[PDB]
Amino acid sequence: QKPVCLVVAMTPKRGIGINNGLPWPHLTTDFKHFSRVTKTTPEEASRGKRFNAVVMGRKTWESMPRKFRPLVDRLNIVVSSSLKEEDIAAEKPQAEGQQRVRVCASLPAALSLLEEEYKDSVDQIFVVGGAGLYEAALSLGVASHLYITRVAREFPCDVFFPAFPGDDILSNKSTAAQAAAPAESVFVPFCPELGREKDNEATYRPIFISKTFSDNGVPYDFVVLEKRRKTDDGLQAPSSAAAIAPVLAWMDEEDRKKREQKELIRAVPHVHFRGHEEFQYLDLIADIINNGRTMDDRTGVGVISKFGCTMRYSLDQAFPLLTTKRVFWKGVLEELLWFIRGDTNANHLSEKGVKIWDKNVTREFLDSRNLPHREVGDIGPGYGFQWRHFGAAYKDMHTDYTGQGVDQLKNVIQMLRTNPTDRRMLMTAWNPAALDEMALPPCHLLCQFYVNDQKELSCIMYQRSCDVGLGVPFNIASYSLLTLMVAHVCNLKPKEFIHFMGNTHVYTNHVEALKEQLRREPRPFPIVNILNKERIKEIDDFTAEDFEVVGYVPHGRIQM
Amino acid sequence: MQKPVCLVVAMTPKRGIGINNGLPWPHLTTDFKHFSRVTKTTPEEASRGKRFNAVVMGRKTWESMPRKFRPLVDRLNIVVSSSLKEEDIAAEKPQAEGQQRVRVCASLPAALSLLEEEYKDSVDQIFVVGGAGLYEAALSLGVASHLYITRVAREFPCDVFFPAFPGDDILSNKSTAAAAPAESVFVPFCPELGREKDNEATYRPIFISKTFSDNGVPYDFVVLEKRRKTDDAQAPSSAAAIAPVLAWMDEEDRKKREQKELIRAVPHVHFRGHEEFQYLDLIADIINNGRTMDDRTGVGVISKFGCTMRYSLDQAFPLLTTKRVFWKGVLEELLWFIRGDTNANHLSEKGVKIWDKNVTREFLDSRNLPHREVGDIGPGYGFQWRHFGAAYKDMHTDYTGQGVDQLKNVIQMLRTNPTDRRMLMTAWNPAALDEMALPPCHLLCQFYVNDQKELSCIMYQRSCDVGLGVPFNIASYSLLTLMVAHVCNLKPKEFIHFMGNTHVYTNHVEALKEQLRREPRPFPIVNILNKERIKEIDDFTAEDFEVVGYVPHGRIQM
Numbered sequence A: 001q002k003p004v005c006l007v008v009a010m011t012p013k014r015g016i017g018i019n020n021g022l023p024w025p026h027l028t029t030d031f032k033h034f035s036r037v038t039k040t041t042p043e044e045a046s047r048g049k050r051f052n053a054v055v056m057g058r059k060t061w062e063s064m065p066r067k068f069r070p071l072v073d074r075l076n077i078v079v080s081s082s083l084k085e086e087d088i089a090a091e092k093p094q095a096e097g098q099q100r101v102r103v104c105a106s107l108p109a110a111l112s113l114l115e116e117e118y119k120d121s122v123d124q125i126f127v128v129g130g131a132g133l134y135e136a137a138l139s140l141g142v143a144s145h146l147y148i149t150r151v152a153r154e155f156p157c158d159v160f161f162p163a164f165p166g167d168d169i170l171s172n173k174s175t176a177a178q179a180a181a182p183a184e185s186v187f188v189p190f191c192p193e194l195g196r197e198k199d200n201e202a203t204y205r206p207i208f209i210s211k212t213f214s215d216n217g218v219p220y221d222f223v224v225l226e227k228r229r230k231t232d233d234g235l236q237a238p239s240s241a242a243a244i245a246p247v248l249a250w251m252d253e254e255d256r257k258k259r260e261q262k263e264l265i266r267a268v269p270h271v272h273f274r275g276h277e278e279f280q281y282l283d284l285i286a287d288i289i290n291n292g293r294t295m296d297d298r299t300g301v302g303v304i305s306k307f308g309c310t311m312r313y314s315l316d317q318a319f320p321l322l323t324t325k326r327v328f329w330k331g332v333l334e335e336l337l338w339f340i341r342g343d344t345n346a347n348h349l350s351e352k353g354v355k356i357w358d359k360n361v362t363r364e365f366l367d368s369r370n371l372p373h374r375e376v377g378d379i380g381p382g383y384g385f386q387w388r389h390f391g392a393a394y395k396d397m398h399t400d401y402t403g404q405g406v407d408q409l410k411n412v413i414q415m416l417r418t419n420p421t422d423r424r425m426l427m428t429a430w431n432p433a434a435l436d437e438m439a440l441p442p443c444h445l446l447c448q449f450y451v452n453d454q455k456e457l458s459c460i461m462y463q464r465s466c467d468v469g470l471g472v473p474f475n476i477a478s479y480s481l482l483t484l485m486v487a488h489v490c491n492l493k494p495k496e497f498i499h500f501m502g503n504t505h506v507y508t509n510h511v512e513a514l515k516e517q518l519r520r521e522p523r524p525f526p527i528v529n530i531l532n533k534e535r536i537k538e539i540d541d542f543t544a545e546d547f548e549v550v551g552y553v554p555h556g557r558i559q560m
Numbered sequence B: 001m002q003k004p005v006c007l008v009v010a011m012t013p014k015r016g017i018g019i020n021n022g023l024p025w026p027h028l029t030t031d032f033k034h035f036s037r038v039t040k041t042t043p044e045e046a047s048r049g050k051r052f053n054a055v056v057m058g059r060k061t062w063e064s065m066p067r068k069f070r071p072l073v074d075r076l077n078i079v080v081s082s083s084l085k086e087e088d089i090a091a092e093k094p095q096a097e098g099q100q101r102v103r104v105c106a107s108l109p110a111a112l113s114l115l116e117e118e119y120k121d122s123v124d125q126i127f128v129v130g131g132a133g134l135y136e137a138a139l140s141l142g143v144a145s146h147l148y149i150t151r152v153a154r155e156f157p158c159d160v161f162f163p164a165f166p167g168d169d170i171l172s173n174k175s176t177a178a179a180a181p182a183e184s185v186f187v188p189f190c191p192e193l194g195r196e197k198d199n200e201a202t203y204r205p206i207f208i209s210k211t212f213s214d215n216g217v218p219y220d221f222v223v224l225e226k227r228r229k230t231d232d233a234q235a236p237s238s239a240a241a242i243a244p245v246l247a248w249m250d251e252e253d254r255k256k257r258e259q260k261e262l263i264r265a266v267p268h269v270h271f272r273g274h275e276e277f278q279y280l281d282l283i284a285d286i287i288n289n290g291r292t293m294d295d296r297t298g299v300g301v302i303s304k305f306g307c308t309m310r311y312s313l314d315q316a317f318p319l320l321t322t323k324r325v326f327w328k329g330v331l332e333e334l335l336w337f338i339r340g341d342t343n344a345n346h347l348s349e350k351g352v353k354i355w356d357k358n359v360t361r362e363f364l365d366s367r368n369l370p371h372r373e374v375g376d377i378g379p380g381y382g383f384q385w386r387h388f389g390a391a392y393k394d395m396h397t398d399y400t401g402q403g404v405d406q407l408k409n410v411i412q413m414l415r416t417n418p419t420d421r422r423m424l425m426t427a428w429n430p431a432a433l434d435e436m437a438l439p440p441c442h443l444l445c446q447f448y449v450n451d452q453k454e455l456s457c458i459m460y461q462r463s464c465d466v467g468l469g470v471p472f473n474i475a476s477y478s479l480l481t482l483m484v485a486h487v488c489n490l491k492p493k494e495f496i497h498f499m500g501n502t503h504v505y506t507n508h509v510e511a512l513k514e515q516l517r518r519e520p521r522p523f524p525i526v527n528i529l530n531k532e533r534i535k536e537i538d539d540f541t542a543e544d545f546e547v548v549g550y551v552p553h554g555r556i557q558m
């Protein structure tokens, strides 16, 4: 009895085709993935001819170009009542060592044919579309695994993958007892022989979530879902390992005792291959809750903290705007352009609807800072003032500072353009002489740039204090966005943002909300495009209308 | 023999194990726990009708054992002796219920046969636990598959020594003495074949732990494995479902790996607990995976961007051991930093010349500082630490009260509000960079206190020569953390190293590959002397520190 899997690419609304074609421009990595999965013999992936079978409906077969069909090096089965096997053979000369294309009247007939006629030759069976055959395979319950390429952008479609148990992997579902009726869905039998019985309901659970890819401006990732019941929950010589085991046992005794005391928090534990880069962020939250120390802090709330943490995010395919909770993109962008301008007037942010600075520039708060001479909204000689005018004497948010202090951002960009191997391309906001004049001591206080041999730019930012629940996603996007902007005006390609964290903490009053967020599987990351690239020559040329975020499909509000 | 035999011992770097029929060092608590856990645990519990292990010892070791511990409880005890009588031992202290009668045997082979014969169903593992006479017999018989060695990092006077053995280079540097065939015990690989030229074994490390200490004594744990000397010059459905996808995702890295000869430090060590493995693994990862480019001086640099390491400070001090670190230089330069001094002649006159090449008239002129006196580093590291933002005239000026004194600010906050999240000290002053002989390399450090009065430090370094600078930099900021912890009545916990451009020079690669053949030795202890006299960071002098148990490998021939 041979394994059956489904292989499909779909939009978040399950769109898979239009006018008997695909909805999107060509997805190059997905095509490699489709070929490799369906052509790979089982012994190869784990490292007389044996081959796999691909089963498709008639429209999917018709949708292919004559030169491309049948799919090479796999047995092709077409489910159809009208197509004839002789016609297919008559299309073009049969190639050597290629299986004759078979036509069957239903999916059960196709599987029975493979089980019986191809018992010694076929290894694996892939159902590869379209919606008619996917629906048949789901309702039959024969698919142990679904290989889904989640395309993050929406496209006009007229053919959709059937709704299925587990399709919350694609998009947000009204499920908090607020749905008007049980969601539309195929019934998937867990034991296929027992059909539709209440006791026999299955669901598909993700075991695999890759990092985000893109081609042709389309972001997407790869997931593998495994059928489950709905009522469900180095290497060394053995002698070497046995000699070592008693020493490890006593060395781990103190940790094992404290593990067995508390319950260990773990983000979406059923996902075994955790390639998505947001798993760094989810695992960080879990590790702070599990292993941080509870302590007191400036605000009085109480925190769990760890000291010295790192994450890295790729910028060459997609943009790390986190998906298990929506990030305030407009605030990230408006605040970064404000920084770049050297602006210290937080009212300019507030009037645009970005309120993040307001609580720290009230008359009340500025007086707690012993700055009663500060007009409301004046953050003092803080972040952007130090970036563009490091060391200048500060009067107020209305003063013109052109030519005062050191313009670090200009110096970094000039060095990247002329001497990109330089090891001093740094920008800092931490000016200890100015700390008492500021509304807040800088939090993200240092960044460093680096170029490799292929004109790829990377950025490290060092943050002294990190609220992982609320601040960290925002800071990831700010400095990733900065890296895209610097790369563009320096004729570089953005490669990586690297995040160095000092005091890294969650607030104890957020612990329960974070546990709920840690039940969410990350979605594919969006793409951030720079618009009007020919117009933008210098870092000061960017405006708030020069950016577009594409394919951003985050989880909704936290039910807590 | 169906039953495994292992040797368990603690020894100084000179193989010393005993004096006056006792141990040569103050009590080592963690080693005593380790000894009990290893010899007591039966592999049902290690891997996770009574079964037990046996411990076999010589008569003097039996006599040395404090009577409250003797016989070793929950283990069968066998004493090898020509004079002790089993009846006398039993009458001296009769055994509790469910404990084993102590046996007496005339030789190690007699003891091992008794165990294979009479204790077939009950004994699991056999440990030889001393002393030198029984260790020598076991080594020469070749019955011990593994050696559990506690490496005590300090020499102590001893009158009894572990025998010289093949593999004892794991302990200390071996001079040009050849002497070994006459000196070392010959260890049969196949014990049945005895001493034949084709039957020669050696012991190789598979396990090196992090460094522990008790009572001022640093030490670590290694397990050695017997080898031939001629060796030397989830559910399957889930996993199978995932495999084709991983196969294509890894195809690019796989085809580059197949073309590269991967560098790997001492790859026979499988458990790599020693914290110096982070440094050795970093060298390897830079050579395997760094990008080769050219730098300021036109030579090749292999570089990576954004690396980290972490070193514990609560038991030992991370003075690296695969190559000697210039401790005097580390300590003098830090004291100089703490003074805000910028006169590199003050270092040079103490035999610390690390700054000289960057304060010569010729070099200073290349910095467009022709008005700088020889030896004047400008407003650099310690000046920014103690006088941040102050305007700089020369290295003779008195800058008292000028600028921001970050170091004093950090100490006062640690003393008064330790959970503050702003305890930072920076040397990166962009307004002063052009006046400095060198732009600062280690430019920012941040402190943190947990709920147990334990202090940690992060230092951020923009440019890291892993071959030469980084071991020095690690010692500098670990030492600074020890000093800050003391004057704040805190305990030092951890030094965390954040690295930007992390590189090795291509013309060091050959010498580095040699270094990567060296197994790390236990870290030494750094003690602060005269603690009662030292109340403020400025109070420390060079005489206030001692380095205990520092046993680094010697110089690289390449």
Ligand SMILES: NC(=O)C1=CN([C@@H]2O[C@H](COP(=O)(O)OP(=O)(O)OC[C@H]3O[C@@H](n4cnc5c(N)ncnc54)[C@H](OP(=O)(O)O)[C@@H]3O)[C@@H](O)[C@H]2O)C=CC1
Binding pocket: A007, A008, A009, A010, A015, A016, A017, A018, A019, A020, A021, A022, A056, A057, A058, A059, A060, A061, A063, A079, A080, A081, A082, A083, A105, A106, A107, A128, A129, A130, A131, A132, A133, A134, A136, A159
């Ligand atoms: N994004 C992706 O991964 C994929 C996208 N697509 C897109 O999907 C669309 C085509 O899919 P679709 O339109 O659903 O058509 P199908 O490929 O499902 O072919 C439908 C035909 O196949 C036969 N058939 C299908 N289901 C059954 C069944 N249960 N029992 C018996 N015969 C059956 C019938 O053939 P007859 O009428 O001859 O009896 C039916 O008319 C195209 O736009 C294509 O581009 C296709 C594959 C994968």
Ligand SMILES: NC(=O)C1=CN([C@@H]2O[C@H](COP(=O)(O)OP(=O)(O)OC[C@H]3O[C@@H](n4cnc5c(N)ncnc54)[C@H](OP(=O)(O)O)[C@@H]3O)[C@@H](O)[C@H]2O)C=CC1
Binding pocket: B008, B009, B010, B011, B016, B017, B018, B019, B020, B021, B022, B023, B057, B058, B059, B060, B061, B062, B064, B080, B081, B082, B083, B084, B106, B107, B108, B129, B130, B131, B132, B133, B134, B135, B137, B160
């Ligand atoms: N640091 C460590 O890990 C350890 C240290 N020690 C230290 O080692 C010292 C004792 O070791 P050591 O002095 O060598 O004495 P031993 O413990 O080796 O006992 C020596 C006696 O044991 C018997 N014996 C030993 N080897 C043989 C043999 N091959 N064949 C027959 N009988 C044998 C003889 O007993 P008889 O004379 O009765 O025939 C011999 O006189 C003490 O200082 C002790 O503290 C001990 C154990 C571990």
Ligand SMILES: O=c1ccn([C@H]2C[C@H](O)[C@@H](COP(=O)(O)O)O2)c(=O)[nH]1
Binding pocket: A298, A441, A443, A444, A465, A466, A467, A468, A470, A471, A472, A475, B421
């Ligand atoms: O960009 C920022 C700015 C602030 N914070 C958080 C860290 C702390 O929780 C708090 C700042 O207060 P202090 O670290 O100064 O105490 O806000 C961030 O996470 N990111």
Ligand SMILES: O=c1ccn([C@H]2C[C@H](O)[C@@H](COP(=O)(O)O)O2)c(=O)[nH]1
Binding pocket: A423, A424, B296, B439, B441, B442, B463, B464, B465, B466, B468, B469, B470, B473
């Ligand atoms: O404390 C120090 C000072 C310097 N370097 C190394 C790093 C670089 O190889 C070189 C300084 O060169 P630049 O990065 O400034 O170009 O010295 C260190 O590793 N540690």
Ligand SMILES: CCc1nc(N)nc(N)c1-c1ccc(Cl)cc1
Binding pocket: A007, A008, A009, A030, A031, A034, A060, A061, A063, A064, A127, A128, A129, A148, A149
């Ligand atoms: C490469 C497109 C693709 N990607 C994935 N992940 N699955 C598929 N089933 C297909 C596909 C679509 C149309 C045809 Cl005709 C064949 C295959």
Ligand SMILES: CCc1nc(N)nc(N)c1-c1ccc(Cl)cc1
Binding pocket: B008, B009, B010, B031, B032, B035, B061, B062, B064, B065, B128, B129, B130, B148, B149, B150
């Ligand atoms: C705990 C000391 C110790 N540590 C180790 N690692 N091995 C040993 N063989 C011993 C030891 C020393 C003397 C006696 Cl009598 C028994 C055991």
